[PDB]
Amino acid sequence: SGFRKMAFPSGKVEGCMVQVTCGTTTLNGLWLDDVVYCPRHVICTSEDMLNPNYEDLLIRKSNHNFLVQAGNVQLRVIGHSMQNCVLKLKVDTANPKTPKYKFVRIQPGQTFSVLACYNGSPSGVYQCAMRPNFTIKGSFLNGSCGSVGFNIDYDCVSFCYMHHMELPTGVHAGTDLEGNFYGPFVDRQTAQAAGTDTTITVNVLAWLYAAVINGDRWFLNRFTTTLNDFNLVAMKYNYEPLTQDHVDILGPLSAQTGIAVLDMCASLKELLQNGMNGRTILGSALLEDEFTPFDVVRQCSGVTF
Amino acid sequence: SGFRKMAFPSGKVEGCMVQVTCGTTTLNGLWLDDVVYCPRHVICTSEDMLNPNYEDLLIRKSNHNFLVQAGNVQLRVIGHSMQNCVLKLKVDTANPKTPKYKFVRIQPGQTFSVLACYNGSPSGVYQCAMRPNFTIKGSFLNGSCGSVGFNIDYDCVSFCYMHHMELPTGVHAGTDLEGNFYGPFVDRQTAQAAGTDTTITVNVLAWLYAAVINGDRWFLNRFTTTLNDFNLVAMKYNYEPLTQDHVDILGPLSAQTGIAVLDMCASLKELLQNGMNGRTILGSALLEDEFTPFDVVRQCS
Ligand SMILES: C[C@@H](C(=O)O)N(C)C(=O)OCc1ccccc1
Ligand SMILES: [Cl-]
């Protein structure tokens, strides 16, 4: 037993991380097959970032304007192109450590592991959720740009996130690996703020299932409810609406604990309207919403990669 | 900016994890150079759980009673010895993925990453502290024995923990990589319980310093305290005593924020008296005690 915020093992991604330098900007690249992926803003100066013309800035650049370093080894860039807000640098060598991977775009509410890197050196790994407002509550310092987020499904790495910027609230914004931003953000130095955030309902329920599986049971009760009834309380408390898709996804945890989702919803309705009355769940005084149902099944059944 | 429970990148440890089978028992081992380290309880049977005689069970094994698998490959055991509660199997192949490593025994309050493994394959990585009562609050299922805890400071992996068992309260006990248990525990299924657990006071102060560096000031107050009056209050909340060593260690966070260690102690006394009043600090509605002064400086600008 026990229940922790748990990241995927990061080894398959550590072997893909490189340093990319253009002018005075150094940040991180993802080296897969014979291509290095990084944020297009690497090619920008300070003056550029205010109103950047990336098309124009990039055609001006040549292959030797990009220094790609994998440890103490220089990669030769033999091509450079842009896809949305990601730069692709073709190199003369395929990464012999390239894992089985694909590029995936995640939905708000889904979780992933971030490998925080500096100058192409992996530094730390943590579990994040894509917030309903398309920010992540990350931990990033200067030089963390191009750090990536991923899941693992068997032996396949699904890359879902690349770090581009910090917002003035301390939350973080970035793209999928095809360069499409998550959320209404742009890669220019301008005034941007996250739409007010909301709580990921189906994840709070998954965490209450993890608590019950670990013998934290005090919050259970004789009551049940309906989606409509619950979603009226949910709307009121800035919780996401709970769909029938969400109730199906919790099916496993519902059956494996003999608590039906709407029975557990009855427990959540009461926690929002009353509080925890001085108590904790799994050593939190908050309702935790960064564990998906899959996360809870994986951690409590001992799934391996 | 941002503040997160952050583990070390697990790749250097992943390439060292193998599966060790003895009899019908399978758990994880750690393959470094030409040695595989694992909990010695792998050599117990169902009647040996309470009072195993390890020296007696071990002398009855040959090298070929040990099945060691590194992915698809079977390794060949050419030797076996016991050091305290750790079994060491000499194998004919050095691990080509062996990183720079050392073994270090940590003190209560220290943090490390755990690579939770099953059948020699990694499931996940998370951050832990050694509790003042020499347990860890891990996430471990049956088959996770031999999973290790580690720090990575500058390309070198310091192994500090190997998982041996779960106590009845659901907390975890294990050894250093020399096989010496943390705390008053033995590798026997005789009834054992941890001492009452306390909060790691120095770690709470480090985390309050991190909150200030990230632009939180709502919990600060105009008061200071003596070290003695602080300990008299804190202990009434099951807080660890704060020592002058603990004060010294917070020096750099004190310097970087311009808040004195004993001013921050006054803040903590007040937070204990009032709670958070529905507010949060760095995302938590509890006071977090699993970040060290060293972790806070490494993660903070
Ligand atoms: C560290 C450990 C030890 O004696 O090796 N220790 C101090 C300890 O009290 O472990 C519990 C125990 C020891 C002997 C008999 C029953 C239970
Ligand atoms: Cl230590």
Side-chain angles (χ1 to χ4, degrees):
Chain A
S1 54
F3 202 72
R4 285 272 182 177
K5 191 141 284 171
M6 175 180 288
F8 288 102
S10 54
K12 282 171 167 21
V13 176
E14 295 170 46
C16 299
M17 293 314 299
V18 303
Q19 184 183 236
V20 180
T21 300
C22 190
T24 63
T25 311
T26 292
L27 40 70
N28 303 275
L30 189 67
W31 182 22
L32 298 167
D33 304 291
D34 65 339
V35 173
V36 175
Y37 300 82
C38 70
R40 64 170 179 179
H41 78 58
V42 65
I43 67 174
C44 292
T45 78
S46 321
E47 312 206 338
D48 282 318
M49 279 306 275
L50 277 48
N51 199 265
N53 190 315
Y54 284 109
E55 294 172 333
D56 210 50
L57 287 171
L58 175 66
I59 61 166
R60 294 168 176 179
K61 294 279 153 173
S62 90
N63 288 337
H64 262 113
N65 287 62
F66 301 96
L67 297 136
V68 179
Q69 207 166 319
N72 208 20
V73 173
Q74 302 294 121
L75 302 194
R76 184 183 293 283
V77 182
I78 63 165
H80 64 272
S81 64
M82 181 171 301
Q83 171 176 25
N84 304 306
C85 308
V86 159
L87 186 60
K88 304 193 304 188
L89 296 177
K90 197 165 195 181
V91 294
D92 70 358
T93 300
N95 183 2
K97 298 198 177 139
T98 303
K100 182 182 180 136
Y101 79 86
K102 58 173 107 158
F103 294 168
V104 168
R105 177 152 184 110
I106 52 165
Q107 297 312 311
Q110 301 195 280
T111 56
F112 55 97
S113 296
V114 175
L115 184 63
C117 304
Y118 294 89
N119 302 104
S121 278
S123 176
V125 64
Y126 51 91
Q127 195 64 2
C128 279
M130 182 60 69
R131 298 308 315 172
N133 67 355
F134 291 100
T135 61
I136 74 173
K137 308 197 164 198
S139 170
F140 290 121
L141 304 190
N142 292 352
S144 72
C145 286
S147 292
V148 300
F150 65 98
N151 289 282
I152 312 190
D153 305 299
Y154 299 95
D155 52 339
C156 187
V157 180
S158 297
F159 290 110
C160 58
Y161 182 85
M162 185 173 261
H163 184 59
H164 285 243
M165 74 197 42
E166 181 163 289
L167 296 169
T169 19
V171 291
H172 303 99
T175 66
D176 60 31
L177 264 297
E178 298 182 342
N180 318 118
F181 264 91
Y182 292 99
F185 306 110
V186 310
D187 49 353
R188 86 189 43 218
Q189 183 44 225
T190 190
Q192 335 190 39
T196 57
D197 203 10
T198 65
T199 302
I200 310 146
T201 304
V202 59
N203 293 2
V204 172
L205 288 161
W207 176 75
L208 291 181
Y209 279 108
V212 168
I213 290 166
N214 285 284
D216 227 336
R217 294 182 76 82
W218 63 258
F219 52 79
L220 295 183
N221 64 22
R222 59 169 50 246
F223 305 115
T224 197
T225 186
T226 68
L227 229 58
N228 286 252
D229 286 348
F230 179 72
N231 280 322
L232 292 176
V233 181
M235 169 166 288
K236 176 175 301 303
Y237 282 88
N238 266 343
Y239 270 56
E240 289 301 302
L242 190 72
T243 66
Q244 172 64 37
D245 167 58
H246 292 161
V247 171
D248 300 352
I249 290 169
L250 288 162
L253 296 172
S254 167
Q256 203 217 311
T257 58
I259 317 166
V261 178
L262 286 168
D263 179 5
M264 187 70 81
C265 291
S267 292
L268 182 47
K269 172 184 309 188
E270 304 304 312
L271 292 157
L272 289 177
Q273 289 173 315
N274 294 281
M276 276 180 234
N277 294 118
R279 278 181 286 239
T280 65
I281 309 175
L282 284 184
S284 186
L286 279 166
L287 294 179
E288 298 295 318
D289 78 344
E290 297 215 346
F291 297 94
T292 69
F294 183 81
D295 291 342
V296 167
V297 174
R298 152 189 84 121
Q299 182 161 168
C300 301
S301 81
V303 174
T304 239
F305 307 102
Chain B
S1 83
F3 213 73
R4 274 271 187 197
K5 261 288 161 43
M6 180 169 291
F8 288 99
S10 61
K12 288 178 170 55
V13 178
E14 285 173 55
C16 296
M17 295 318 299
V18 298
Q19 183 183 245
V20 180
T21 300
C22 184
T24 68
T25 314
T26 291
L27 44 66
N28 309 286
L30 180 74
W31 186 20
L32 302 171
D33 295 315
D34 63 336
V35 184
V36 168
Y37 303 80
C38 73
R40 70 172 178 174
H41 72 63
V42 75
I43 76 186
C44 302
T45 72
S46 302
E47 305 87 56
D48 282 314
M49 298 311 301
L50 250 348
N51 297 285
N53 191 310
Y54 281 111
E55 174 199 15
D56 183 74
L57 296 170
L58 187 59
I59 196 160
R60 299 178 189 263
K61 305 285 163 174
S62 53
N63 294 321
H64 61 270
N65 300 126
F66 299 104
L67 315 162
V68 182
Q69 224 165 308
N72 240 41
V73 183
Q74 253 176 65
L75 290 174
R76 204 178 130 255
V77 180
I78 67 181
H80 63 258
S81 82
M82 191 165 59
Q83 173 182 11
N84 300 305
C85 300
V86 153
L87 181 68
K88 313 208 286 209
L89 311 174
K90 204 188 164 189
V91 278
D92 56 351
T93 320
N95 182 2
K97 296 186 173 165
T98 303
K100 305 175 159 213
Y101 76 91
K102 62 174 77 171
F103 300 168
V104 312
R105 191 178 172 84
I106 61 173
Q107 297 297 316
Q110 190 55 272
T111 62
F112 54 92
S113 302
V114 168
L115 183 62
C117 295
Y118 297 94
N119 291 116
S121 301
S123 174
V125 63
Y126 55 83
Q127 276 298 98
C128 278
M130 184 59 62
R131 305 310 305 175
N133 72 359
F134 299 92
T135 65
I136 83 177
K137 300 179 173 161
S139 174
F140 287 126
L141 303 175
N142 317 71
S144 56
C145 298
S147 292
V148 300
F150 60 95
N151 293 274
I152 304 188
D153 285 322
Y154 325 104
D155 256 316
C156 175
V157 179
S158 61
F159 294 103
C160 57
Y161 177 88
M162 177 170 273
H163 183 55
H164 289 241
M165 54 189 190
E166 185 172 298
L167 303 158
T169 62
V171 301
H172 301 109
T175 66
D176 63 26
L177 270 291
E178 300 189 301
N180 298 119
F181 267 85
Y182 289 103
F185 306 117
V186 291
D187 49 347
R188 286 164 59 206
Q189 286 195 340
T190 191
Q192 297 173 75
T196 61
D197 203 22
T198 61
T199 301
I200 306 155
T201 305
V202 61
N203 287 2
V204 175
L205 293 173
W207 174 77
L208 287 180
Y209 276 115
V212 174
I213 292 164
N214 283 78
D216 279 343
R217 283 184 75 98
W218 69 258
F219 44 87
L220 293 190
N221 70 24
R222 58 166 175 98
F223 296 118
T224 196
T225 177
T226 72
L227 187 56
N228 208 262
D229 288 340
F230 174 71
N231 288 323
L232 288 173
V233 175
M235 291 182 69
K236 298 176 183 168
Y237 295 96
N238 264 337
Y239 270 57
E240 280 291 288
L242 197 74
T243 68
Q244 184 54 44
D245 273 9
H246 293 157
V247 171
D248 288 350
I249 285 169
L250 294 155
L253 286 164
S254 187
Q256 186 192 327
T257 63
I259 301 156
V261 173
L262 289 175
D263 278 357
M264 191 68 74
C265 285
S267 234
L268 174 50
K269 281 160 69 167
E270 175 163 294
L271 272 160
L272 289 168
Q273 161 191 288
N274 302 345
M276 299 218 173
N277 207 21
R279 272 169 302 215
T280 80
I281 300 169
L282 297 166
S284 182
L286 283 190
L287 303 178
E288 295 299 318
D289 79 342
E290 294 211 347
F291 301 92
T292 70
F294 189 110
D295 296 344
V296 161
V297 164
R298 202 111 148 176
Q299 174 163 168
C300 286
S301 86

